[PDB]
Design a protein around this ligand. Structure first.
Ligand code: NAG
Ligand code: NAG
Ligand code: NAG
Ligand code: CL
Ligand code: CL
Ligand code: CL
Lengths: 390, 390, 390
């Protein structure tokens, strides 16, 4: 089930160490073997974002109460409320017609001030992922017939004592893919999504910093509050309805994700350098597949420029290297754009996942060789930060 | 024309692979050779940013129309327009003197509301560069007397089958230089620039999100709209002129760039790891140049802390290694700050480009050795995010 | 005093080079030795941020002057000042009661406009750290009984000529820790701190871009200016007091830092690749310590997910490798989370600094082996962007 390490991915020093390159991906596992020693398997078990920090909190459903109004006759100066100085209250000033009909001696404009207590009933949260929030669990197994390493951005190294092999240093790092400098973790009610950062920051909803506070204070309350037309001595303040639906629609397309509590699981990807004592490894070679491939399921599209292609092999020469190729709208082989490190059919009955990064516009993906090749036309749209929240 | 790979930049494993480090730069090309095999050349052909996402769109020239006004006599309540609820319209409320002279029974303040339809005639766009937007074209050539690899951040690897050499893995990554987390791609009319991100975001112009929408809706329209003084029953709304000139001036200094359509060409820089089967390479050594150097052209200054120095050799010992040195305001040799990987005069008649990163403040650049050395004094100003848009 | 390089951290090529991995940390130094040659020591001397760019400037103490007011009788139209068009002035409009008592013929609302000249007396500054702002000084010493290399993000390489050893290429990069894409350099009066970026940007203080300008122009002046109640012909404008105290309190917890002039010193961390000609190095092995450890001082907590643990060894087998382990709230050994590259007691009388990255929530740190182990319970709180400025 594991892909063997080719001899192009390690060097045994005349003196010193044996250095090995391996790429760990969710599902796949990598294996190798030394001059008369047990088999060695490495595998990425999971990837977790834990306790990310809140950037802001936005309010999608507010309520109104304690509506207070103060009015003054034309010759009685400017109205005033003490809740003007209260930050839980949203206020509004104006001048209304006053006269004999409502207790005044002069027909004319009288001052009016109206304040109402704002409260966020339903809020969402945008959380930024930092180095300290990311974690990987890598399992290393010596086949005497397993040790789970913990890898993080700040702590990428993990020294482990193995049977027969000795000390093994796991020097791993996250592969280039998701960018947490750009993408943000949005959480509304129960569901969660990965959304661009500025898109979030520009959302026209009442917001409050993620900073630590005892007094939740909102900004842009007007966005959910509507001061109806004022009367001589009173004025109604109403509030917009829940904006959960308007958001769900604006989030259409944005990648949805699973998070239980303060933990969010990802499909991680690691590039690792294995350091062990001077040792002659047994490299594993794979001949190119010669048979046919069938698309076990539809070509899936990620939100950061890639596509996932799962295929099934119909040939008789497994294990073998899946021939892959990409061609722009006009039949130019790109000699690249293959993201998967180990595109190997290790088992004929097991489907093989293939990630690739098509050119922008029209193109063609090709898995297999010759006339027996699976040819698929793909259109890739320019980048976008998301859909407008209306 | 290609710089030979020194023996300090590769290791032939007792077993396993031959690993090679090479730095590809626009113009330069790197070469090496094995125990009785053809010459091998690598070269970076181009670097493209394609279909970057819009952050915001700013309006530098707006127009006004459908100016509508509604006024009310002192005793007739608050004026009102239905375009108050229309987002294409920019509105403004006030109270104007009303009386017998304009149809009213009382001399006094009458309400007034004026709305005008806002339209962006000329806009600019700020676009963020993500991993999925970057692409490199690297050509690998075996001198039997060429294969073009595609390298991207997410797909840095490229396996290629060569004649005599066999499979060759290109594991390349962008060198540290331009930071697309900080710099933004600004596009006005036809010209384009690299500008800091917050500088852009703080621009005092009407703006609209880059998010997908059918209804272009602007924010901060007031910045280009001027409500003239109101009269009893009417009020003129005028609009500022094109701000293309005010921007051109504020962009003075900002790096200008060439982009045809959705593609922007850069002068890229790659650090690459070449993986091939166990093989004894022929390292290339270069003695330090002993002759003189002339500045073919003026020392150019980049906008991210570097300077480009092109020189021409007057000596007789090419190919040779250009002696380079940097000294702060007080003659301290820095033993670094040389960005170019291969500072080699491979051809006496070809000028050699040299990138370096001077200290801040006064300093001295020195190319060549001894009394025959080219000595240049350089002042480097502290970092800035750009010039204030006035 | 230097930690010896293990044989797992270098490879001598059958042909080509000897490649060596070393991690340089403030305080520590690394050493190695070749087949009959002098000892080689490497050490990180300092890390400097120099001339970082200003993002914005915020005003914590403003003053008011040139307060000008213009009022008009009910039948005399809308007041007006020429300083309305002046950006140094903060203005405010209203309607005040006018009548016989103050020169008017009609009792009614008269227009009023008040402008005051705003000036920032005390300001702070938020500065972003870019690649061009970072610098490292690494010293390389051949023990004949030293050469200082300059390392920067854009210029990570440094070729150096050594005695007996020959040319030595320092290929160093900053270890993953502080993120200058997220953290900002705040400077108020004399003290300085590392603060999150959005926290800063959302600060409710008057602000002005860091862009180059001759005319300092502020935004959100209202935040420090208070227009008192207006009278017929006059109106006082007052200003808030210094907000240095409100900031000091909001900065509580934020890491304080030392900066003389335009330079800020950090406790840097480098991972380096040493390239030298084919050479057989003498690897250094360290047996696990068997004795006891005492906490020379209290467990310190960084603001990016780590903790610093300094211990002192009570055993008799130095130099030795400090046994380290981490366990989550329920006794699960993590097989990682150790940040320090060289956890070695090279000298019994010298305390040893140990950086580690605990899990979130409750956990246990363990230094030493067996019953002689130092067991410490640690609680790690979720990430935060800072404390609310009130
Ligand atoms: C008004 O709301 C309730 C009355 O329903 C009252 O008990 C409360 O004290 C008031 N709140 C404020 C802050 O005015
Ligand atoms: C006003 O503009 C034109 C008249 O020039 C008219 O045809 C159009 O329907 C009006 N637009 C709106 C939205 O008021
Ligand atoms: C007002 O301030 C001083 C008077 O103290 C005067 O000299 C100055 O010219 C005035 N400034 C402005 C811009 O009004
Ligand atoms: Cl009435
Ligand atoms: Cl009149
Ligand atoms: Cl009066």
């Amino acid at each position: 089930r594991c892909v063997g390490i080719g001899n192009r991915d390690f060097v045994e020093g005349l003196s010193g160490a044996t250095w090995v390159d391996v790429v760990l991906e969710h599902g796949s596992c990598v294996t190798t073997m030394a001059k008369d020693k047990p088999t060695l398997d490495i595998e990425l078990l999971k990837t977790e974002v834990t306790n990310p920090a809140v950037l802001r909190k936005l309010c999608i459903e507010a309520k109104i109460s304690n509506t207070t109004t103060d009015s003054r006759c034309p010759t009685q100066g400017e109205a005033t409320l003490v809740e003007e100085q209260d930050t839980n209250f949203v206020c509004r000033r104006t001048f209304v017609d006053r006269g004999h009909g409502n207790g005044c001696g002069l027909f004319g404009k009288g001052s009016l001030i109206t304040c109402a207590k704002f409260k966020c009933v339903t809020k969402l949260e945008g959380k930024i992922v930092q180095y300290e929030n990311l974690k990987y669990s890598v399992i290393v197994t010596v086949h005497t017939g397993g040790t789970i390493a913990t890898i993080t951005p700040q702590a990428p190294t993990s020294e482990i004592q193995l049977t027969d092999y000795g000390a093994l240093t796991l020097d791993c790092s996250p592969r280039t893919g998701l960018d947490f400098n750009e993408m943000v973790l949005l959480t509304m009610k129960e569901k969660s999504w990965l959304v661009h950062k500025q898109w979030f920051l520009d959302l026209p909803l009442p917001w409050t910093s993620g900073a630590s506070t005892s007094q939740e204070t909102w900004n842009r309350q007007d966005l959910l509050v509507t001061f109806k037309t004022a009367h001589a001595k009173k004025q109604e303040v109403v509030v917009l309805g829940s904006q959960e639906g308007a958001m769900h629609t604006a989030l259409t397309g944005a990648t949805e994700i699973q998070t239980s509590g303060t933990t969010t699981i990802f499909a991680g990807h690691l590039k690792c350098r294995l350091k062990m004592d001077k040792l002659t490894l047994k490299g594993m070679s794979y001949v190119m597949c010669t048979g046919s491939f069938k698309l076990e399921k539809e070509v899936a599209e990620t939100q950061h420029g890639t596509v996932l292609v799962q295929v099934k092999y119909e040939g008789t020469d497994a294990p073998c290297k899946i021939p892959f190729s990409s061609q722009d709208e006009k039949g130019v082989t790109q000699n690249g754009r293959l993201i998967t490190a180990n595109p190997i059919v290790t088992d004929k009955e097991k489907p093989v996942n293939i990630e690739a990064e098509p050119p922008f516009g029209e193109s063609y993906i090709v898995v297999g060789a010759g006339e027996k090749a699976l040819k698929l036309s793909w259109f890739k749209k320019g980048s976008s930060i998301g859909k407008m929240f209306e």
